[PDB]
Symmetry: C2
Subunit: 420 residues, 2 copies
């Protein structure tokens, strides 16, 4: 009768087939780009997040007072824990390419694509302030989205905190230099409120006008110099990043002045994989945050990376009807008539030692129920031991898929299956 | 500047650390799945009420618990079973039997005193829906398989006991409550041999049984000896012989009967087992047993259950102790340049190498060749591809075997195929 806290999920086998696929694809891709896995505690002291620029996720922390009187919280994100670890390894030659895939928590109201607990992949490069670093992490994100079977549903949209901190300064020197909070909601709120929020910030008509025009849709990077800022340095960097992206095979990336990102520790490039169908604005996203390390430890460490939650990916995988591949072939071993479990165990052992997943019948059920069960668990083959056929050193192998059956010599069972 | 450290009792896992953890996860998962078990997961937070059925307020004090909005107590899960059981009894379309395994984190609010951690990866494998020898054996076989595949074969010994067995043997020596004696037996490795006897003799046990208990706790016995040592041939001893026989067909031999395994006997309803460390450093590397009554108490629905648990910490110490060599899935390649060379040409080839099953790390920082090779070595790359502008004009690139130290020129057109064939 005791139920699970609402907002949390249970993962039955079929649900985990999907999650595992997400874990495998993310991990294999990251390692292919040279990233190495790390992990950190799931609980931290709340004071860890009391940092200027890292106050966005502190808004929904699953915090509480341990029985020791101190305030703690389930981690809402992985970045600060990762940074604390980075600044503790001055022995490691740069760059540092680390990735993680921990659970993170957030006390928010559930909805299509979000729970209070989820698996979040993270990949970050520490130590390099180069365009190559910005491009590599974005290339890794695309690679993952592609290998997941989502290659045609997203668009890579980029921008930069420098490009957007000078534009709204190359016209309006209004000290509220970071109207960034306003632009972040451009796609959330209505156009009228957006125009007056920025207007009540102390921006002239021409300013509000261009800012609105710049936010409207995605544009080319090359035209950016034109429509504003005659070839600054950050614009040239974005161009370089675009070119570098093409070399990895990543194309159609687009500039979008409305791409800001919620987290406030971003200082350079910011990006998101936009869902072309319009269901999710950010399937994944990240950027460069060259000041977090200093703020937390006093050591300056350039950083660029991104995050990807499992919930939204699960939805897309289903929506786009992706086919989750199956690693090993599974064999279900049945029994009809009087047959010792021992001999079945012996052969299951032999099949396993040759790379196959084998499930043995242990229930006192008939052959009809056995095959029903075999099909219910998705076995690829059914090896049926029959008391009489065993006398003649024969066993029946059924192809659960085709429906085909054949008798097979005991000493040809292993090889016959391996050849399907 | 100063830093807020992580909570005492918790661990950070650096790349080198995760190399070990990944091998444990991978080995456990593949073995479990090879036996037909299927992975599941569940919330890391549950209502504290979920644990009250199987544990008392005393044990429930070591949980990372707290009060929820509606004044409801919730906790970071201290173990996996109650959650797993709740899932078994929350969906009624589930076939039978159910072979499920999980490997999430679990938390325990305990002081860093007893060399442990407040958080660790806990692996659990259980068979639900079958009260048979076959099930008892499969679970134990799976545990052995995992220990052997971890490179820990030869250091552990499977030791089994049984509640029904202990009751028959104790009941035949005294009429008082059996558990009062299980407690003493439970103190066998803590008190003195002289004090042990006194306690056994205070519970109404003659020199007769007192002698058999002391002997039995001093050494393990074969399943055979039991029928005679206890002078009885009950159905329970045959059940264990039946299990031993089934284990043999799985390749699991030298199973021992250990009378002293009594912890949890109030929880378990049938067989219980542990993987004992020969080097006598850890009494139980992993373990479990049958607990056919938990499901009923939790849902009202009767559900036989057998399984075992295994922590990452102790496995981690054993791997180091036995100096186990951990394999590397793929070959690693580092690509760098000397002289002016476009980053794009390096990206192009790393993509081609990755699409061919290799892990590739491209140099993205400005630094001399010597420092680059030092870096390649630090990350354990197997090969380094050196792009030199002059050499590129001639269509060649230098490739060095990071282990041999040698290097050959290779045509761009053959870099991929060349590395693919090279095996260090």
């Amino acid at each position: 009768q005791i139920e699970k806290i609402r907002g949390f999920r249970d993962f039955y086998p079929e649900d985990m087939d999907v999650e595992k696929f997400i874990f495998k694809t993310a991990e294999e891709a990251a390692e292919a780009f040279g990233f190495r896995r790390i992990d950190f505690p799931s609980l931290e002291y709340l004071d860890l997040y009391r940092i200027k620029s890292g106050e966005e996720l502190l808004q929904q922390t699953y915090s509480f007072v341990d029985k020791g009187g101190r305030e703690v919280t389930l981690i809402p994100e992985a970045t600060p824990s990762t940074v604390r670890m980075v600044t503790s390894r001055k022995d490691l030659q740069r760059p540092l390419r680390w990735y993680s895939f921990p659970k993170v928590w957030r006390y928010e109201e559930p909805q299509a694509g979000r729970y209070r607990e989820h698996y979040q992949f993270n990949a970050d490069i520490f130590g390099s302030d180069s365009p190559e670093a910005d491009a590599e992490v974005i290339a890794l994100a695309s690679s993952i989205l592609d290998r997941l079977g989502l290659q045609d549903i997203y668009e890579i949209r980029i921008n930069s905190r420098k490009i957007m901190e000078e534009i709204i300064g190359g016209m309006t020197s209004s000290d509220p230099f970071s109207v960034f909070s306003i632009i972040d909601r451009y796609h959330k709120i209505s156009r009228e409120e957006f125009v007056d929020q920025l207007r009540s910030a102390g921006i002239g008509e021409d300013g509000v006008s261009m800012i609105a025009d710049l936010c409207s849709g995605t544009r080319g990077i090359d035209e950016m110099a034109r429509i504003t800022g005659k070839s600054s340095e950050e614009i040239a960097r974005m161009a370089a990043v675009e070119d570098l992206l093409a070399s990895y095979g990543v194309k159609n990336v687009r500039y979008d002045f409305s791409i800001v990102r919620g987290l406030s520790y971003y200082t350079g490039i910011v990006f998101e994989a936009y869902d072309r169908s319009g269901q999710f604005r950010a399937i994944l996203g990240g950027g460069r945050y060259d000041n977090l390390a200093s703020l937390m430890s006093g050591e300056s460490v350039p950083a660029v990376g991104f995050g990807m939650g499992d919930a939204v990916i699960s939805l897309l995988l289903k929506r786009e009807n992706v086919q989750i591949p199956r690693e090993k072939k599974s064999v279900y071993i049945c029994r009809v008539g009087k047959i010792n479990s021992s001999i079945m165990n012996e052969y299951s052992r032999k099949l396993r030692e040759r790379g196959m997943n084998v499930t043995v019948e242990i229930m006192e059920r008939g052959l009809s129920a056995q095959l029903k069960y075999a099909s219910a668990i998705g076995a690829d083959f059914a090896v049926i031991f029959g008391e009489r056929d065993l006398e003649r050193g024969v066993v029946t192998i059924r192809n659960m898929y085709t429906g085909s059956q054949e008798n097979v010599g005991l000493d040809s069972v292993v090889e016959h299956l391996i050849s399907q």
